[PDB]
Design a protein around this ligand. Structure first.
Ligand SMILES: *[C@@H]1O[C@H](CO)[C@@H](O)[C@H](O)[C@H]1NC(C)=O
Lengths: 40, 49
């Protein structure tokens, strides 16, 4: 059996600035977008 | 420019251990300061380019 460490990465948050809006977007760095649907 | 590098100081020092993470907090800002330093390098690559 190969052993691979489970998916991990830096997480960056993108904001308009809060005074402008409370919306944000999250960038899960170096993660394929099949891994976050598998994954406080 | 040079390759941007991000290291997670906690994942490098303490690979998936709670015990090592709780001991690493005894040093305090040392872990964050080293990510701030590498982020200052990573951002000025895009500036240099
Ligand atoms: C946020 O920006 C608005 C202008 O769009 C300004 O009127 C307001 O005072 C700013 N907020 C603070 C805390 O200064």
């Amino acid at each position: 059996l190969d052993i691979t460490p489970c998916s991990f990465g830096g997480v960056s948050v993108i904001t308009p600035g809060t005074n402008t809006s409370n919306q944000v977007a999250v960038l899960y760095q170096g993660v394929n977008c099949t891994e976050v649907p598998v994954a406080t | 420019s040079m390759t941007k590098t991000s290291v997670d100081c906690t994942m490098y020092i303490c690979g998936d251990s709670t015990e090592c993470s709780n001991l690493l907090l005894q040093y305090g800002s040392f872990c964050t300061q080293l990510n701030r330093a590498l982020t200052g390098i990573a951002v000025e690559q895009d500036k240099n380019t």
